[model samples]
Target: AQNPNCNIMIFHPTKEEFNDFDKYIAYMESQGAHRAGLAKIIPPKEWKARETYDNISEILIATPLQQVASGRAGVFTQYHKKKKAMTVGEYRHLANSKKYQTPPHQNFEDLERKYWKNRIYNSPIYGADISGSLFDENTKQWNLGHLGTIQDLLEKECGVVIEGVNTPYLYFGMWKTTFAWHTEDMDLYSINYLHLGEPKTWYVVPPEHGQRLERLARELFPGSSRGCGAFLRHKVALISPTVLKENGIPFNRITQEAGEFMVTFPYGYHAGFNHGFNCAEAINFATPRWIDYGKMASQCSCGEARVTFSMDAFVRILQPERYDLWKRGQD
Candidate 1:
C-alpha cells in the first residue's frame, strides 16, 4: 500500500516483557534452529575452542534472522582438525564432554580483551532450529544472560536492543577465521565490522554488479581472487551520515575499531584481506527487513523496494521450523 522508500526507525526496550536475558533466550530458543549464539559470548576462555562453541558455529546462516533454521549441520570444526571430518554422534559426544572446562574467574571485560585481540575468522558454526528447542517449556520468557559477557557489551555498551522497535545501532563479532565471498541475503540490511591485528583486505561485490570493483582489486593484488574483488567493486559505506568519501559515499575503514553498522545499497561490492600477522573481530548489524532490488526499477538503480512482512512470515521464509515451534506454543 505504501510507496517504496527505505526508512530506518530506532528504539530501546526497557519493559518487563522485553528486557533482560531470560526473555531474550526464550524468544530465541522458541523461534527454532535459526536463532544462533556465538558461544564465546557465554563461556570462559578455557572453553573458547570447545565443542560447545563449535556446535553454535555449526548453526548460523549468512542471511535472514540468526535464529531461523538451515538445511544442513556439522560443517565446521571447533578445535584444530588434523582430519577432514567426524561422525555427527562423535561430534555431539565431543560437544557434550565435560572434559573441556571454562574458568569461572575471568570477568566479562577480561573475556573481551582476550578475544578482540585475536585475528578475526569466520565462525564455523551455522545451522537452524526452533525457538523453543533451547529451553524447557517451563520457561515462559527470553534470556539475555545466555548471550554471555561479550554479547552483554554489545547489548549494553554497544547499544544493542534485543527487544526494540528497530534493531540496534551497531553490531560486532571476533573471528578466528574468514567468511565465504557471498553477497549478504537480500532481506536484511548489513555491513562488515573489521578489526585486524595486521593489515587485512577484503572485496565485497553483489552477485549482480561487482565487475568493476573486482577488476580493480585484481590489479592491486595479483594473487587475489574474484571474492577479493568486493573491495574494488564498491566503496564501503558507514552507518554514520557525516562520513563521506570522494564520491560522497563512505569507503572502508570507517571507524577505528572492528564493528558493523547499519547500511543499505543496491548491488554494491566489498571484500576483506589480512596481510599482516594477527587476529580480528567485527561487529555487524542490519535491519531485519529484506528487499529485492531486481523487482522494482523506477524507485532505484537496482530496481527494488523494502519488504515488510509479519514476524511470522519473516521467520517462515527464513526459518520455517521455528514457525512450527511458534504454532506449537498456541496448541
Candidate 2:
C-alpha cells in the first residue's frame, strides 16, 4: 500500500555513528520498514570469519534439531512435506563436499566468479527458533550492539509471535540457494543480517508495485492463488530482474557483504540467491502503521488466515483509553 517508489538504501556506519540507537530506529520508522535497504554494522576486530563459522557450526552440531532442506527448488517451491530434514552437521558436510553440482544448463561458470558465481552444492542451514535475545551469551564474542534489540521492541508492541515472524530464523546458504520473490508475512517488516559469507544479491520491488507484480506473477503462472498461498506453494513463476525491467517494473539491487544487515519494508517484494557459502539470520516485526496491512494479509484468497496479532485483544487493550478520548470530545 506504501507508494514512496524508494529504492534500496545502504548504510556503512562506524560504532560511534550509531551510538544513538533511537535516532536510527526513528529514521527507519519514519521511512517505513517497507523500503528496501541495508545497514552494515562494523563488527568488533576480534570477529574473524573463520572463527564465526566454527563457533556457529559447533552450536548447530551440538543441537539435535533438523535443518531445513537446502535443495535447489527450496527457494521457489513449497517444501515437500515428505522431504527428510537434515541436521546442521549433515548440511555442512554436503555443502562442503561439492557433491551436488548443478546441471550444465543451470550453471553460471562463464560469468564473473565474484559477481555472478552460482553454487555447485546448494543448500540452506536452518537454525531452529534462534532469536536475537537468545544470542546474549554469544554476543560477548560477536557484539551486534543495538541491532539485536530492535526485534525486542517490535515483539513488545506487536503482541504476537509468528514463528520466523518475530522470532529470528537462521539461514546458512551455499551457492545458488535462492529465496523467491515474496513479501514478509502480513505485510510486516523484516531485517536480515548476513552474519558471514560471500555477498548475497538482493532484488527488491517497492511495496506499491507488489500487488501489480503479483498480478504479473498470476498472469505468468495462472495456477497461483492470491496472497500468501502463491509464495507458500511456490506457485509463482521465477520473475527475474530482466523480466521485471522488460515489463517496466521498477526494482533495485544490492549485494550484501559480510556483516551487512538488509531491511525489507512491508509488502516490498524481494528475492535473491547466495553467491557462495554464508550464514544469515532474519526476523519479522511490525509497528502501529502495519495494522491495516496485517488485517488484509490475514485473509488470503485460500480461505486460510495467518493472523499476526490478535485484533480483539488489541482493541480491548485500547478500548478504555479510546472511550475516554471520545467522552472528553463530547463534553
Candidate 3:
C-alpha cells in the first residue's frame, strides 16, 4: 500500500545487447546497478516469447486470498497453491457461472460480499512450472538454452536439467496475486521475462540488506521464526516496502511490462504482485562467480520444513570446475 520511491535502472536493448549474456551482466555490474536488487529490461521491439490460450493445459491455480487471510497459518503455512484448475479463456471472462461446475454455496452477509468476496472465483493461475513439458520450444531471441544463459552454463552439457534452475518455468498471475518476499533458491541469480499480458510491480532490496530484511521478517513473524530462523525461505512471509522503509532499510520499486525482462542478482531479495492477468517465464542461472554465494545458502532450517539441492553436488553435477575451486580457494 506504500510506494517506496527508489531508482531501478531500466534498459531498452536490442537483441545484440551483448554478445554474451554473462558479459551483458558484467556490464550492468560495472555500472553497479545490480546493487538495486533487480533491473528491468525491455528487449527490442520485434522480440517475443509467450503462449496463448490454445497452448495452456488444465493447469492447477492458487487461491492467494486464502493465503492472505491466514497470515496467522499464514506466516508458518506454505502459500496454498494448486487448489483448482481452469483454462486461460475461461479465467479471463466467464460467459456464465453455470458454464462450469456450480460452486458450493458459502456463508456471506451481502450480495457485494457474495459477488466479490468468494474465494472460489478469485483463484489465480499460479504455478505452471512448465519447464520440460510445455514451454520446451525456444525462440531465437528467447532461447534460455542460449550460450551463457542457462543452456551452456547448467543444462546442455550438464548431466541434468535443474528444472527451475536451468530450465524455464512459466507463472500466470492476476490482480493482487503475489510472490512473497524472498531470495531465489540457493541465492542464485534469476531472470524473469514477461512474455505478454499486464505489468507487474516489483519490490527489491539489495544483497547487503537481504540479511536485514530477513532479520525484520524474523522479528515480526516471530511465530514462524521459532524453528527456522530463515523462515522467509518457506515463501510464506511477505512484508510491504513500508515496513522496510520505516526500518530505514533502502529498497527499490519497479513496474515491469510485457516484453520486458527483470534480472535479479545473486543473494538479492525480491518480491512482487501482478497488476493484472499476465504470464512470465523465469529461470535461475549462475555466473562462474555465483558459487561463492551458493555456498552461503542453507540446505534446510526446519518446520514447514523443506530442502533445496545441495550446493556441492550441483557444482559437481554440471561442472568439474568444482574440483579446481576445491583445490584453489582453500583459504
Candidate 4:
C-alpha cells in the first residue's frame, strides 16, 4: 500500500502535446520523471479505447501470486506452487463470484498480509497476445498498438514483428492480483493502457533505488540470490511499504484508472495489484537512447540466462550506419 497521503507526478497532456508523444516524453524525461521509474499519463479526456474483440472464452494459463500456501510469503524465495488456469469466462465468474469463499490462510503476519492476502484462486494473466483479435482496420488511437509516437525502434526499423516484445499483450486482472517486482523485458521502456478496468495500483522504485532494493532483498534472501541472477526477475519478490521506508528506499504508488497510460522507464522496478477485475494492454518500446541500456541489459552480472532479442544483431543488420555512431559514442 502507498502512504496514501503521497501522490506521484501525473502528466495530464493536452491533445496536441500527447499527439507529439516523443516530444512530450522527452520533456517529461527532462522534468526528472524517470527518477520515479514509472510515470503516469492521463491523456486528453477524449482519448479512449473500445474493445472490439468478440471472443470471451479463450484459455489463459495464469500462475498464482499467493505466497502463503508454501509459507514463503515473508522471505524472498520463489513461491507460486502451480495452482489455477482456465478460460476467460470462468476466471471472470470466479473472480466476481460472491458465493466463492477465497479459502483460508495461516495466521498471517501483518507484513505478509500487507504484501498479499493469500487470496485463493487469485491469478493474473500476463503476456497474453490479443492484438490479432482486435479490430485491425478501425481501432482507437489509444489502442496499445498505436499509443506511442516513437516505438519499436527495432521492429519498425527492421520491419519484423518480434511477437511478445513488439506485440500487444492483454492482461486479465482480478482482485488483489499481483505481479512481483520486475523491469520490462530487455530494459526497454513500456506503455500500459487500461483498455477497460478498475484502478490498478502500482508501486515503483526509482532507477537509483533499484540497486538499494536489490541489495536489501539479496542481503536477506541470500540463498535465492545466490542461485537466481536478478532475484526480482523471478517475479516472486514483494516488499511492503513499511520495509521499503525502513530501508530508506524511495517508492511512489500510483493508481492507474481506465483511459490512462502508465509508462515505465528503462530499468524501473515495478510491481502491483489490481483492485478488482479489469483488463489492460501493454507493449514495450525503445527510443534511440535505449541503444545504450539495451546492450548493457543483455549482460547481467548475476549471470542469469534468458534468451532475448539481440541489439547487436539488430544494429548489424538493420541500422549499421547508426550502429557505428553508437559504438563511437559508447554510452
Best by lDDT: 4
How high a TM-score does candidate 2 get?
0.65
lDDT of 2 by residue, 182-283 (tens): 776545667677777566778787766667777676665544554444443242235666567777777777677776667676677787766656677776
Task: Give the higher-lDDT candidate: 3 or 4.
Answer: 4
lDDT of each: 0.27, 0.51, 0.60, 0.62
Error of 4 at 34 (Å): 1.2
- Reference-based TM-score of each model: 0.26, 0.65, 0.72, 0.73
Model 1 lowest lDDT segment of ten: 33-42
Task: Give the per-residue lDDT digits (tens) of candidate 1, residues 1-101.
Answer: 11112112111223453335434333432432111111011121221111222233242222211111111121111222132333333333432344311
Give the clashing residue pairs of candidate 4, or none: none
Taking all chains together, the TM-score of candidate 3 against the true structure is: 0.72
Candidate 3 on 78-115: residue-level lDDT in tens? Answer: 35544455555555443123432223344212321332
Model 1 TM-score on a 0 to 1 scale: 0.26
Query: What's the distance in Å from true for residue 166, model 2?
Result: 3.6
**Number of backbone collisions per candidate, in order?**
84, 5, 0, 0
Once fitted onto the true fold, the runs of candidate 2 whose alpha carbons sit more than 4 angstroms away are 1-5, 20-22, 28-51, 60-85, 101-165, 226-237, 295-298, 301-331
Give the CA lDDT, 0 to 100, for residue 134 in model 4: 38
Point out the higher-scoring one by TM-score: 2 or 3: 3
